[PDB]
Design an enzyme around this catalytic site. Structure first.
Site, mmCIF file in Angstrom:
data_model
loop_
_atom_site.group_PDB
_atom_site.id
_atom_site.type_symbol
_atom_site.label_atom_id
_atom_site.label_comp_id
_atom_site.label_asym_id
_atom_site.label_seq_id
_atom_site.Cartn_x
_atom_site.Cartn_y
_atom_site.Cartn_z
ATOM 1 N N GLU A 22 9.715 0.980 11.005
ATOM 2 C CA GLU A 22 10.768 1.972 10.876
ATOM 3 C C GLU A 22 10.095 3.316 11.072
ATOM 4 O OE1 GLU A 22 14.114 1.739 9.968
ATOM 5 O OE2 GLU A 22 14.196 -0.440 9.708
ATOM 6 N N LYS A 62 0.862 -1.192 0.000
ATOM 7 C CA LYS A 62 0.000 0.000 0.000
ATOM 8 C C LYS A 62 0.890 1.231 0.000
ATOM 9 C CE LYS A 62 -2.321 3.416 2.384
ATOM 10 N NZ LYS A 62 -1.509 4.505 1.782
ATOM 11 N N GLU A 112 9.536 15.421 16.602
ATOM 12 C CA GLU A 112 9.971 15.318 15.220
ATOM 13 C C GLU A 112 9.274 16.394 14.381
ATOM 14 O OE1 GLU A 112 8.833 11.745 12.711
ATOM 15 O OE2 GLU A 112 11.019 11.666 12.504
ATOM 16 N N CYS A 117 13.436 10.526 8.348
ATOM 17 C CA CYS A 117 13.357 9.956 9.687
ATOM 18 C C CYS A 117 14.641 10.199 10.484
ATOM 19 C CB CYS A 117 13.105 8.444 9.564
ATOM 20 S SG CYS A 117 14.246 7.556 8.459
#
Ligand SMILES: [Cl-]
Ligand SMILES: [Cl-]
Ligand SMILES: [Cl-]
Ligand SMILES: [Cl-]
Ligand SMILES: [Yb+3]
Ligand SMILES: [Yb+3]
Ligand SMILES: [Yb+3]
Ligand SMILES: [Yb+3]
Lengths: 493, 493, 493, 493
Positions: free
Chosen positions: A261, A185, A392, A295
């Site tokens: 992750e 997906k 973040e 990331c």
């Protein structure tokens, strides 16, 4: 840097199941946009729970004992993957353009870095296919025992929008090399490159149902994958927040295996003895690469007091040199953020930096009349309690902090629920080894930052992830070990 | 078979944290019973969320960089584990008695099998301590890259009641060998052997806080472990039902790593060409061992039509030869079930077998005036829809089924959400290899059953587990891989 | 430093075959001496070709399929080795005294270093026994393929006189762990510790014929081993000169496998930025340890011009602090050389240093009225053509050289047929990694020297050896890989 | 089976050094023949000691630190090897024709088997290039220790005439994948395919001096390689007799590493319960493939008494069905032997079979007016003392023997100095595993024979070889392990 000398035409917009193109069961579609212009690029079939169910049935059938994918030589799985890399190489211009146009990614990077990494990683994975081996084991008693490192089965793979093509290959390469079948997906923001790759999977000659691609939304198609009772494993890259939902849903459904992750708030530690120019350049590239949408963004830079002012000065000089604009135009060095939600979150965080008393050195606002552009921003005198030091950002926003005590700064570096990566800049052998040992991060760079290769495992400590991708070690999470123990009359060493 | 020539005295009943004995924060205690007599054996301190918090702080402190456990030679961790095995060997008589008395386990088995497996497994794990190695990797570009296979950190370990001592060692051996610290919650039914082992951990010289043992209940102390924000990994063995709750809570809390060893409904396939006597004996031992209270119980035995009647006959003859009673008395060959809940569940399932029309061949009821005893029970003509063919019984209840088609019986064998183990009985080389390849089970035995050794990885496919324990492969889930990448001027092969 | 409080009595002086003590076939004996006094210690049975033949027949019989050594659990081989370590630990005082008395080795070193290394290495090897594993391999076509890592068979092992006990264990530990049988020929100078260990092998319970020990001379018993038509592998540590004869004789006889650990002329490179005191101390210990009688002696020390004079000065200060005498007396810090031949060779080389114009800084002659003592000697201004810069001295003689160019000094360091080890002293990360990569040596130490552990493979490049001992990698040369490929109807991944 | 539609033209006949074509230093040439017609095909430059010296200097220079081959990414070495495979695939028609014409090899086999194996093996080796990894090791004390698995250096590789192209790739593939440079000496009978491959190595873009090819004779160029003081390793495939000379010369010169793949006298054991037709077909193909010119020829077939007559009958029927002739003509099923010496040896051995009283079932003489053809020959009632049961024939000559006792036949099977391979034919699981364990052979096939793949290590026990080629394990003999140990202030797990 060659370019596509014809305007890009979009062709593949449908759901890919059993190597055929399908409309959605509902018949619904959803729009795909260019983030540099805010205009629609095309309509794509909207996959939902019914379309995922169809994809999983196809993947299950392709995984049955006696099927072509299960019975072909491991070396032939490798050949198919090497063929697929050759095809992606052939379509490099169009894929890089599509990635740049759809993803807001600088074309030079998309062509020279993303596509090269895609091809290299696929070729690396192809090489492992016939080198995945089990063991013969000297068990107690009169038995012959061996292990098979089998594929797990049907793997659901949820790809992020930041590196759509690279992350597609990071997931499918190892999964396919090990002999799994997949239901992919892609991100709702960026389904286009994945569907083109599906066309090449068909062309390369993969058996039908080995790779199925269902574009659609996270809460619908993504949740369907994570909660499906016949998917054996889910792999997800994205926010730590969604990662938690994925892991929860795997537990509540069928205890499917999960690799994640996730986010980071990665620190760099710059010692007084570091090559300062090298540290400034790598820390800068570490935080600003792809508009901060990595990331591993080097989002907390701790610099020893005595070189701190010089570091900030040199950092600010570097950050003021960008040219914002459409990522397809040569010379442009910063593209847009991916979408409104990310854009909003970044501006809201930048506002807290100002408000909570961080020192704004440059940037700090939006740019342009269209596209989701944010000025490259630097904050100095950041403290550990500030929102910009804890959350973040996923935007072009650099935080620079001061330290005097190495014991204390390692504690500060580690004082986060994140743990994806870290950087250490020093000329001292002992410090390099001992600091890298003490940092709670999955990858530690020494005198560099952001160096990722197919040969190295990559993944997070703590809430930055579960498991590893790539390298020899990353292949482990795409196999299931079966022990076979056979009674024999008499064993001999 | 030597015995303890003095009556067993219980000594260790408190919470073990930082190598000291603690009362519960609440001050509460809970009773421990003998399942053969239904009488209380002693009172044990009831650990709860407050006591787990204390244990985790101790484990975290023992894991800090620069601590004795982190800085000692890997070979010294191995030495401590080998010392601990020598101490368990020294206390073999008392541990085996305590296990038999507390766990309802036949003493001959407790002494000759459980304690021997405990000692052997510890010695195996001790040997791995200084053999856990990372890699040096030929990454693209001018870099030196290596990996460290570090311990993960604080591991919460929830031990089942069926093999309290063996499973304690299956968890702590690898965890400690790899350099982790542990917070252990033994089963509420069976905390006594774990606390004695804690006394030996102190005696062997493990640093304080490396092993902490908190007795208490699942919903309180177990949930506290699974939901704790500073436990890095949870390992659990028990029901698939609780396994699902553990995995859910890890996702909702801190995304801690999870390994699960769960239920089974393991099939055996007996081909017409099998050594029939060998197959009857192994299938029998496979289902009836420790009163059927094994995850790997051979609880669905499929036998080819032409030998089916002979198999059932020989099976029933074997099952009628047991002597029920107190597991400490020589000559007794079947002890009690562990507790009321398990006892009730077993009788309720046996009742469905009768009701749904399975053929009762022997047993089928309770036994005695005290203790949780169930007559050894055999059902023939079982069909795939019956409760006794679908649900884990965890009792002395054998199901024997008929087949004629090998394709069909493999499908039937695999048609379950479980997948822990399986058995194949045949003299044909091709059948042995191809059937074992086709079965969706973590361990497949050929012409035997229930052969488990320290050298072999063990774990489930599907809802029977996540991850593997023991062997080389099982050590992987107790390490965390860190990649370190160092910039260099020029690399050379 | 505890000591043996009773005078040492010698007991085991005969040939050890099938766990029994044998006189020599000829009936001949040979004398064993103390090198500190030049007096005879005892007489030992002189093994020759007839005695080796008897030992090989015993080893062959113990290796037959179906024998106790071949059929016992791998874990039991490990247990026997761990038992043997416990017995050596029990006899530590007597073995260390015997080693000191027979080998001329400082007692503190013999007790604290040699015996500790013996015990640790045995325990390490014991841990590998049940962890030696083959592979299951995804071969092309419809086959099941696996490998067995079998023991090779009868291994002839020729032990040197410099570290008789440590090197005995470096050879027998891995060989036995892997399941081989052995015929050991200890050095003619130093057979006594090996024979005592043989007594402990019998006591530990090794099956007869698994370890056989034939004392005797190199040209007779050693040549018999190397040329024997039924020895599968020979392992030798000693001079490169004899190593060449061993390899030749293996080719001419039965193509037996050969591993060789041979001489060195190992270089250290001290950069101007090195911690000078640390470098001086390690380079000193590197060359002077055990009277220079180490293969890895740091016998060419290259120091950057600007720190060269200071290095030489500090080196000479350190070398003048020794106390020569009997190695059993506390406070004595240098013992004798092993025998007359070695003694002569050392004095003859020291004479060439003087003659060819090296600068004598201290020492340069013999010492005492008895025993083979050489004054610790330092030569500065040594050039690459001098005998003392080219030939292995195997004595307490340090060579210190000057360099200005790093490119040039690496070439000089590498310009030898030897290649056992090397040292690099620097504070620079890049230099440490790149210099260590460029040196043609099997072990490179950085900011240290002579650090050898059971966990690390050890062996030479070039004419310093073939193969590796110890670590995971060293176990490979004691197995033979057998591939088994089975035809099957249909393979599945 | 496509064919070359143009007559083959020979082009490359010179020595290949530094990617350039050289005449011999002497200026001498030697003739190359077609064994099917006995006519000369061309003249090739005769390399000698002077030409080997030139090749070794080139290989040494290409291996220097800082050179392109040493500094390129491991993944790029892999890419070059995959490119080379693609080029060999492109030239498949011409290479297969050249192989058939020069080597006397059936064209269908040369095209469908040899060339396919060449390409597959190269692709397999390419995949390992960036997957060769060292270790990080938890050494005792405060040190950081890692290993590098470096290339050894300059490898001399002596290729046999039986499978010139396949064996060229078996040697260069792993050597190059690991980063070595090579000096190759193809067989004097068959240099042509190697020189064409050299042209493709240049075309693929390998740096100069990485592969050098020196055609010439064994006693001159081969001896020069084996005795060269600057070749680090020699790999040889051929007769056990020459293998002994190679190993001797390595010892006498520079102790270079040696791997040897040598003769065999491989046994098959056919049990009474075996699928007889399958056993007859595989044993037949096992001995008669490529005119019996395989090291693994199934040259002693032991068949259980009760099926022996039927086996012989069915064997003879199969052997009488060949069509001898030129190996290029479709439908021809047996080509010539390679040369006069081999031809003479085969006829002389066949004569001993007749003379010593073996029963001649078919064949037993030469065939034709030109070419080195031998009739396919079967001998039954062969006994263990006969020359044809002891000596490698290397011709189309099958020996069939009788047994009644399995213990005895395993002893007979093992009673040889050879040990390359063996076959076991049985339907019994226990027998398959236990017999294969007991046979002293490097590869054991079960219910098949001659199945060799890139993924499996291959090599001999005893005098059939030293070391292994291919698989993961075969890569070990092309690396040299270097341990690096770095002093650090404090280690942490
Ligand atoms: Cl495994
Ligand atoms: Cl790794
Ligand atoms: Cl292997
Ligand atoms: Cl290694
Ligand atoms: Yb706007
Ligand atoms: Yb009751
Ligand atoms: Yb004297
Ligand atoms: Yb002729």
């Amino acid at each position: 840097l060659p370019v596509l000398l014809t305007d890009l035409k979009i062709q593949y917009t449908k759901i890919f199941i059993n190597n055929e193109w399908h409309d959605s069961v509902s018949g619904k579609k959803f729009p795909v946009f260019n983030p540099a212009t805010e205009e629609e690029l095309c309509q794509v079939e909207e996959g939902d729970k019914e379309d995922v169910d169809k994809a999983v049935k196809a993947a299950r059938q392709a995984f049955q004992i006696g099927s072509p994918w299960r019975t072909m030589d491991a070396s032939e799985r490798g050949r198919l993957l090497y063929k697929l890399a050759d095809l992606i190489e052939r379509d490099r211009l169009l894929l890089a353009t599509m990635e740049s146009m759809n993803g807001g990614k600088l074309y030079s990077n998309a062509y020279l870095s993303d596509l090269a990494g895609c091809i290299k990683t696929l070729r690396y994975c192809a090489g492992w296919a016939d080198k995945i081996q089990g063991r013969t084991i000297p068990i107690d008693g009169n038995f012959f025992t061996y292990t098979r490192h089998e594929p797990i089965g049907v793997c659901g793979q949820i790809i992020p929008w930041n590196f759509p093509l690279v992350m597609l290959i990071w997931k499918i390469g190892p999964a396919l090399s090990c002999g799994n079948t997949v239901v992919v997906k892609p991100a709702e923001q960026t389904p286009l490159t994945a569907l083109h790759v599906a066309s090449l999977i068909k062309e390369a000659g993969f058996p039908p149902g080995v790779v199925n691609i269902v574009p659609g939304y996270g809460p619908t198609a993504g949740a369907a994958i994570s909660s499906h009772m016949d998917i054996d494993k889910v792999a997800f890259t994205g926010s730590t927040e969604v990662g938690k939902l994925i892991k929860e849903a795997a537990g509540k459904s069928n205890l499917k295996r999960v690799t994640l992750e996730l986010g980071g708030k990665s620190p760099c530690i710059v010692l007084a003895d570091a090559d300062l120019d090298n540290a400034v350049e790598f820390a800068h590239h570490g935080v600003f690469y792809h508009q901060g949408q990595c990331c591993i963004a080097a989002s907390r830079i701790f610099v020893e007091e005595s070189i701190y002012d010089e570091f900030v000065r040199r950092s600010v000089e570097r950050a003021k040199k960008y040219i914002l604009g459409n990522p397809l135009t040569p010379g442009v060095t910063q593209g847009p953020q991916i979408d409104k939600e990310q854009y909003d979150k970044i501006l809201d965080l930048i506002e807290s930096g100002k408000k909570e008393g961080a020192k704004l050195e440059c940037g700090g606002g939006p740019w342009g009349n269209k596209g989701y552009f944010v000025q490259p921003t630097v904050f100095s005198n950041v403290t550990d309690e500030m929102r910009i030091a804890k959350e973040e950002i996923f935007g072009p926003v650099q935080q620079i902090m001061k330290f005097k005590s190495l014991d204390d700064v390692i504690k500060r570096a580690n004082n986060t629920f994140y743990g994806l990566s870290a950087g250490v800049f020093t000329k001292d052998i002992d410090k390099a080894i001992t600091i890298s040992s003490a940092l709670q991060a999955g990858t530690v760079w020494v005198n560099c930052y952001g160096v990722v290769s197919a040969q190295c495992p990559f993944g997070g400590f703590k809430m930055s992830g579960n498991g590893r991708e790539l390298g020899e070690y990353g292949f482990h999470e795409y196999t299931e070990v079966k022990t076979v123990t056979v009674k024999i009359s008499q064993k001999n060493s």
